[PDB]
């Protein structure tokens, strides 16, 4: 078995910026990795394509995944509305870590965040499930449009996404 690789093509106010590819740790968190993989291909009839990064805080992370309410409060998993915290084997060790946003224990939906720094205070509370494989330079460019309160100065969207391998 090989971990799946998924990609997002990012755009800033409709202008293509670049591609970021992620490796998902299906060998350690199969259920969480599968949810993200299926949401990236759009194979269940809904997903990340066309959604945006609604909250970006420089030096911390870029958060996205709300394809429903499109305002930071929505999204859902391929298993229904929410699912359990699979495990917390992996930690928020540095830039590039892919982890799930939530509203407390066992409330995983579709929202996720890409860490741009080590965030150890999130360990044991947020399920880490992948890492940026290529295109970390695109994530750094994205960070430039965020702010301390999270609001972005330009609309950052996932113009296209899918599975590479």
């Amino acid at each position: 078995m090989v971990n799946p690789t998924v990609f997002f093509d990012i755009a800033v106010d409709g202008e293509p910026l670049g591609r970021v590819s992620f490796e998902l740790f299906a060998d350690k968190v199969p259920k969480t990795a599968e949810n993200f993989r299926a949401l990236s291909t759009g194979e269940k009839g809904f997903g990340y394509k066309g959604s945006c990064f609604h909250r970006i805080i420089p030096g911390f992370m870029c958060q996205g995944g709300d394809f429903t309410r499109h305002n930071g409060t929505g999204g859902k998993s391929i298993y229904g509305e929410k699912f359990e915290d699979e495990n917390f084997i992996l930690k928020h060790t540095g830039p590039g870590i892919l982890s799930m946003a939530n509203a407390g224990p066992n409330t995983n939906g579709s929202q996720f965040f890409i860490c741009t720094a080590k965030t150890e205070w999130l360990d044991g509370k947020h399920v880490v499930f992948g890492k940026v494989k290529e295109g970390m330079n695109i994530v750094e460019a994205m960070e430039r449009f965020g702010s301390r309160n999270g609001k972005t100065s330009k609309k950052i969207t996932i113009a296209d996404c899918g599975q590479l391998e």
Partner: peptide
């Protein structure tokens, strides 16, 4: 603060 929540974003 620096949290990543869905619904009630805290300081």
């Amino acid at each position: 603060x620096l949290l990543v929540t869905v619904g009630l974003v805290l300081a």
